[PDB]
């Protein structure tokens, strides 16, 4: 039992669907939120770098 | 040096395989979670089959067949037998069974039960969960009104199955038994039946009507040692081995074990494992599986064998550990990982190729 469905042909090929059984039963963040995350990370870098340069000054 | 890891501390069989492997001096045990093993002797639950066979430079082998639980849970065993054309609804060696929940078969179970209500001939069944196995959660009853209420009084899924009203009874005793056969399936899907089986004997005479004598009706080892006053009378540990059971069959019934029982057992084993081979085989796979099974059989008055259960993680009987575990190493482990440098095999190979 194999029903052949929506057969489409053309010069370069053909396509179709074969069914063996039917179905057995029945936030993307803004430009601003991205900038306020890259910038936040850059601040954490600058902080870490300033702390190093404070230590080297001592 | 080959390497292995041990992830089931409670396995008596693989405890002994571990010892035997170390004692060769060509197998080192690694820590549980070191991924650089040749052999995994694995946990019973959530064995991480998806992590096997992705370590370059290591052939990896495991002592379980992924998907073998379709055979080894009672509910799924019944689904497998009913729906597979290799083992039809008319399959002659499995007791008539129905799966039942607190998908479901209650109304098809009653439809065959009403053939027996219009029947003068036998309505005793049994009800069981796939793993409530402490000796408990087993009801025998002449009618469904006690069963279906009992199944809902316990939490999990259950199977209702025909009770073999007329079993074969060993004399002296007028008593019940089941047969345990140990089957090793290797990485090439060779089916190896161990030559020694064992009868788990009841030690109490059989039957009343008020069944409740989990001792004469249920032949589990734990149930005999606790509830049976006659534990150890006729054979020690309530365990009759094949030399004695053969001899009894020759003396009492004029047949052999081979002819009367083992042909049917070999047939059943082979039919079960060849059914599931395409779903579990590791023939062209990136890791390899072997597994030891315990098939449990009943014999009736007619010397007809019936399959009760398949155990995916069996224990051995105490006398036989040495021999079986050495055979697992030779056939299942050293076949893949050969050691350096008159044999008669302890297994019988199940193959049979009839033309039609």
């Amino acid at each position: 039992d194999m029903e052949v469905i929506e057969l489409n042909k053309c010069t370069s090929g053909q396509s179709f669907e074969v069914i063996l059984k039917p179905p057995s039963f029945d936030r993307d963040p803004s430009l601003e939120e991205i900038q306020k995350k890259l910038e936040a990370a850059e601040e954490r870098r600058k902080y870490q770098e300033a702390e190093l340069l404070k230590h080297l000054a001592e | 040096m080959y390497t292995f890891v041990v992830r089931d501390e409670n396995s008596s069989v693989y405890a002994e395989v571990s010892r035997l492997l170390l004692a060769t001096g060509q197998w080192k045990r690694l820590r549980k979670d070191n991924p650089r093993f040749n052999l995994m002797l694995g946990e019973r639950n959530r064995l991480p089959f998806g992590r096997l066979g992705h370590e370059p430079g290591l052939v990896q082998l495991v002592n379980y067949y992924r998907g073998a639980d379709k055979l080894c849970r009672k509910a799924s065993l019944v689904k497998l037998i009913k729906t597979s054309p290799e083992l039809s609804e008319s399959c002659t060696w499995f007791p008539e069974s129905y799966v039942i929940y607190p998908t479901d078969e209650r109304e098809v179970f009653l439809a065959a039960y009403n053939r027996r209500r219009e029947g003068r001939e036998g309505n005793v069944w049994i009800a069981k969960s796939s793993a409530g196995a402490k000796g408990e959660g087993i009801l025998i009853s002449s009618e469904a009104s006690e069963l279906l209420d009992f199944i809902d009084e316990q939490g999990q899924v259950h199977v209702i199955q025909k009770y073999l009203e007329k079993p074969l009874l060993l004399e002296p005793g007028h008593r019940k038994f089941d047969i345990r056969s140990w089957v090793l399936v290797d990485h090439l899907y060779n089916i190896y039946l161990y030559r020694e089986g064992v009868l788990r004997t009841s030690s109490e005479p059989y039957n009343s009507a008020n069944f409740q004598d989990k001792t004469c009706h249920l032949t589990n080892h734990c149930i005999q040692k606790e509830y049976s006053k006659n534990y150890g009378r006729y054979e020690e540990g309530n365990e009759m081995f094949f030399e004695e059971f053969n001899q009894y069959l020759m003396d009492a019934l004029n047949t052999t074990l081979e002819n009367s029982i083992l042909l049917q057992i070999k047939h059943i084993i082979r039919s079960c494992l060849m059914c599931i081979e395409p779903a579990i085989s590791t023939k062209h796979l990136h890791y390899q599986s072997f597994q030891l099974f315990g098939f449990d059989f009943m014999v009736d008055e007619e010397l007809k064998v019936w399959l009760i259960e398949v155990n995916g993680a069996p224990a051995c009987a105490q006398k036989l550990y040495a021999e079986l575990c050495q055979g697992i190493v030779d056939v299942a482990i050293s076949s893949v990982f050969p050691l350096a440098d008159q044999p008669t095999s302890i297994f019988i190979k199940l193959h049979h190729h009839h033309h039609h």
């Binding site: 052949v4 489409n8 069914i19 029945d26 | -």
Partner: protein, 439 residues
Amino acid sequence: MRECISIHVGQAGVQIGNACWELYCLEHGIQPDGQMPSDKTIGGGDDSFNTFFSETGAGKHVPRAVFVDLEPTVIDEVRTGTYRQLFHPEQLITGKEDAANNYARGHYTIGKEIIDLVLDRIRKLADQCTGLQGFLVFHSFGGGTGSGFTSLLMERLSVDYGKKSKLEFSIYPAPQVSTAVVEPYNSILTTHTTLEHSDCAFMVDNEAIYDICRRNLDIERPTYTNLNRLISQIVSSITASLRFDGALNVDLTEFQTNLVPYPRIHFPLATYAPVISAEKAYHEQLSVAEITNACFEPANQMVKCDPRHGKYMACCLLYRGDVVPKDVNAAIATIKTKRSIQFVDWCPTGFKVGINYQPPTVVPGGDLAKVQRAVCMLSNTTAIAEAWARLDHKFDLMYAKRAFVHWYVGEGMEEGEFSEAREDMAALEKDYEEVGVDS
């Protein structure tokens, strides 16, 4: 006709892109200079191949392609190689120092300084499109650029082109050819951050391709050239429907419709057959039945996993060469009796089939023999979650000791992102468990 822009990020993405465009050119009869004699509409057109190639007044056929790497050496080989003329310099974008195998360095540190340039070069190609349909993004999971920059790029593409479809070709890390120990970290970080931005993603495990190249091409030690030519054959199979006439998978939206009913579960398994060595003197050509049956062997999959122990949500068969429906249906019937093909209960058990009569083109002098018929199966099976379980377990091992974590924190990333990313993967593994398994 609706155009598709290809984006190649990092070493893996760029080298696989090279392989694909080399192949595409050979398939469409486009020479290295960009001339296509068989194209008789000089200076433009809306043919199916114009999905992937724009045209110039002088008859040059130019890929709708952007190459992005944070160091110049790999894209410099494109700038100086056999297909140097093919691409416009503005398509080939390079930085000076790479991400050092560090996701955080590719995403936050070095990513921030080049992201606005890349989007501007992407916008230049989008302005030449009458009906931009979306993007094909090629990258590694394991590289710092492949992982870090890609996830940033994908976030922005959703902002600037919210109605367009985005497909990935993603190389999943394999220790046998990887140069980095932190690839599990990188892989999970980029999967977490990319997951909502990708409509459909084809994972290729370098382990699978490496071993296919070993067993079937008789190559002792496969190079990236070997791996990439095989991958491009597969990528070409998947994209054929967009660059050729037909009625199956004609548009990026259809990949999602046909392969992805549950949006987060958007990782179809590719399986491809036959792979046959060009040095093999006597080859018995394989039939429709034999190659279709080959689509159900794990040894031919792009990820080693076991489809018998999961469930299918969709299956597409893409044939190239001498194939007619009758043979396919007879093959499928035979295959369903012998094999364990369990679908989920809420989908039809069935196959969408696409046939293109041109047999696969092989690169002259390559490792793959010509064959009269080949097939690529795309099946969305829960068995691909095995790869996630392998990757997550490796991540758990390292992250439990915080090993290498300081390298990421030091680029401005916070430790919580590890556990947040790992939690999403625990949810992903559970989604696959729900769909694919019973009690």
